[PDB]
């Protein structure tokens, strides 16, 4: 009952402007199907579509519980719904995957690398997945990657899809108040409406009043993701939760979303992938032939202009304007990372998390031993010119020893840390009476020895 009393929704009560089609209004619905305020004159009413979705067909039977929320709501009210009503802990990582709304197909082992590589990173960090909701394009690759692993939904995979309410097929079938509404994995090819992804877990249906049109979720998702980043993480050392942005393909619009993330306080690192095409491939080709970031010569500039006007089929002035936004992204070339095939996107996502953390390197090392990932440490935490505090490497070595991390001990031996200077009587004693690690039979033997001693 708290869902209906706290969150709102809006319905299309307009003057029905015809524009193109006589049946299609400004909101695109049928003329007799009715029942922002500019040209739509919408009214505010309490929500009538919340509860749980039972997915019939489409593989495994899975429940993805949902709520229809007005697009102008404050994200503070929504975060209380995740934490209290939906019993979700605060994530240790937020990732937000964007891309093209059009369906596409990539390389088959690019689909394998994206398959295992994402869902391993979500498992090791306990992360939240933020997609576009509907089962088109990049999100169709997301749910297919969830078909690869599935399994531990109890380990908080949490693929929350944020989609507009207007384009999800069978809207009247999904009307209920805390009631299990059965939903089909049938998607009609004749209908322009597209269905939700079948293997999600939570849904933020954002109604702006209109139907069949996008843009009802972009402003809500950006304000929500900022709102999570202001929440202090459970380590409570002075940092919020990390946020990274995963980019595959995309159109000319997603380039502006990159500049929105980069020109932001705090800055959000992005990661791109190669081989999908379109906006991801032009951002990749910008990165390798870049020199000093925005310092791009004329011949490579014209090669970028002709590839924009060919792949995105734009004009000369539209390609030049997209090149301006690409140069504005180029200024912050350090924040972006590029994944190239030929190894997974685990290392790319976690490297971008390291770059966007901007914390102390002993804290990065402690996060690395928590992650059990050695290669991330050897390629990022031992950076060229990394400041090392006096004794912090010794504490990291001690934690690696008591945590049973043999490869990390190999790393700290490889990068300094004299074994003679490390040892102290109290150090060996405090690593002799540690409880973290495997099962210890030393207690019983030391009890028997102290008993037989006297």
């Amino acid at each position: 009952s708290w869902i209906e009393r706290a969150f709102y929704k809006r319905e299309c009560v307009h003057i029905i402007p015809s524009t193109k089609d006589p049946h299609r209004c400004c909101c695109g619905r049928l003329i007799g199907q009715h029942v922002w305020s500019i040209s739509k004159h919408t009214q505010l009413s309490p929500t009538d579509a919340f509860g749980t979705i039972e997915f019939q067909g489409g593989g495994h039977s899975n429940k993805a519980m949902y709520v229809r929320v007005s697009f102008d709501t404050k994200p503070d009210l929504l975060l209380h719904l995740m934490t209290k009503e939906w019993q979700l802990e605060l994530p240790k990582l937020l990732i937000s995957v964007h891309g093209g709304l059009q369906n596409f197909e990539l390389q088959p082992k690019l689909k394998q690398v994206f398959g295992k590589g994402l869902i391993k990173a979500a498992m090791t960090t306990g992360a939240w997945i933020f997609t576009g909701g509907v089962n088109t394009g990049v999100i169709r690759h997301v749910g297919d990657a969830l078909k690869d692993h599935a399994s531990k939904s109890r380990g908080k995979i949490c693929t929350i899809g944020i989609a507009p309410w207007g384009i999800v097929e069978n809207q009247e079938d999904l009307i209920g108040r805390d009631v299990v509404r059965p939903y089909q994995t049938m998607s009609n090819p004749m209908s322009k409406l597209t269905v939700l992804n079948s293997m999600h877990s939570h849904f933020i249906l954002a109604d702006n009043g209109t139907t069949g049109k996008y843009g009802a979720e972009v402003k809500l998702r950006r304000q929500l993701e900022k709102h999570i980043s202001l929440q202090k993480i459970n380590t409570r050392i002075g940092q919020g939760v990390p946020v990274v942005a995963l980019i595959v393909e995309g159109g000319p619009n997603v380039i502006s979303i990159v500049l929105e993330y980069l020109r932001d306080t705090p800055p959000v690192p992005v990661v791109v992938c190669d081989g999908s095409g379109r906006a991801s491939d032009i951002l990749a080709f910008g990165h390798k032939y870049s020199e000093e970031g925005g310092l791009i010569n004329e011949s490579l500039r014209d090669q970028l202009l002709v590839t924009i006007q060919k792949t995105f089929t734009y004009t000369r002035t539209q390609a030049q304007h997209l090149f301006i936004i690409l140069m504005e992204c180029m200024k912050k070339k350090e924040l972006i990372t590029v994944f190239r095939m030929g190894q997974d996107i685990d290392l790319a996502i976690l490297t971008a998390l390291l770059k966007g953390a901007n914390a102390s390197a002993p804290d990065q090392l402690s996060l690395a031993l928590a992650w059990n990932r050695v290669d991330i440490a050897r390629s990022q935490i031992f950076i060229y010119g990394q400041q090392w505090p006096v004794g912090s490497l010794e504490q990291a070595m001690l934690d690696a020893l008591v945590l049973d991390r043999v490869d990390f001990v190999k790393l700290l031996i490889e990068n300094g840390v004299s074994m003679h200077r490390f040892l102290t009587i109290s150090r060996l004693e405090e690593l002799y009476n540690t409880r973290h690690g495997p099962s210890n039979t030393l207690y019983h033997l030391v009890r028997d020895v102290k008993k037989r001693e006297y």
Binding site: Q107, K109, G342
Partner: peptide, 30 residues
């Protein structure tokens, strides 16, 4: 190695098809 060989031969044969299209378009114009 035959897993990456098969993937790259799928890409190389597609690129050879694009090579055939480009060569036919070049030969048509001259």
């Amino acid at each position: 190695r035959v897993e990456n060989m098969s993937m790259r031969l799928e890409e190389v044969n597609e690129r050879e098809h694009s090579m055939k299209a480009s060569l036919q378009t070049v030969d048509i114009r001259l």
